[PDB]
Amino acid sequence: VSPQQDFSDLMKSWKNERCSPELLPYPHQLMKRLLNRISMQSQLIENISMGFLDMQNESKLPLLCMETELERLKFVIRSYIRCRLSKIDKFSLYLRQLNEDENSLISLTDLLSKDEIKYHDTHSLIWLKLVNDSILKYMPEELQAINDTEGSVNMIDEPDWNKFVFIHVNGPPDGENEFGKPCYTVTIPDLKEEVELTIGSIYVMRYEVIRDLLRDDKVAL
């Protein structure tokens, strides 16, 4: 609940995002309390900056500090969402097929932002509308639908769960998953026998075997 922690989780989310091959859940509970918090301090600093001129017929430092800080954290999330919108641009179709299907969790108000959902549907719409008056006129009857034929394929791709991601293993020990010799976690790849995993050492593997560790935040990326 502390500010510092929300920030550490912001950074964590940012890294996990730029690393992974695919989209991650939209963390509204935090990102919204920060989107309120910055609206607060950006008003506050302009207020203290304006009140400062009244004592003027001293030290610009905490103001400069504050402002630089705000530039840094207003950069962070802007990288975040400017990235996620790109992965939405790449996965728009996949997500659509994920939405038409019942199981398991569709976009809702969670998997995407209430702001992002608009971006998604509108981009999707104007894209289909572009290709529609451009190359489909002139429309193949089988190719009317944008979806699997199958082959090849299309898109479908790319929920690619096998791609490699550098991962650094961190999390609180009980002394849950620690089987020795050093520590957690399993592993159990499908194709191969366990390594398994050691915590003070970064080990690159597929994204799929570790997705559950990612959920728990037991390994940073």
Binding site: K163, K192, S201, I202, V204
Partner: peptide, 29 residues
């Protein structure tokens, strides 16, 4: 594929060679 021990390694060292390793791992695997 799929394993590597890169043990203790700098963030910068990770970042420089990342596209290379995690690309040809994605041709290899």
């Amino acid at each position: 594929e799929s394993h590597l021990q890169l043990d203790n390694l700098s963030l910068l060292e990770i970042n420089e060679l990342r596209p290379f390793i995690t690309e040809i791992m994605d041709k290899l695997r």
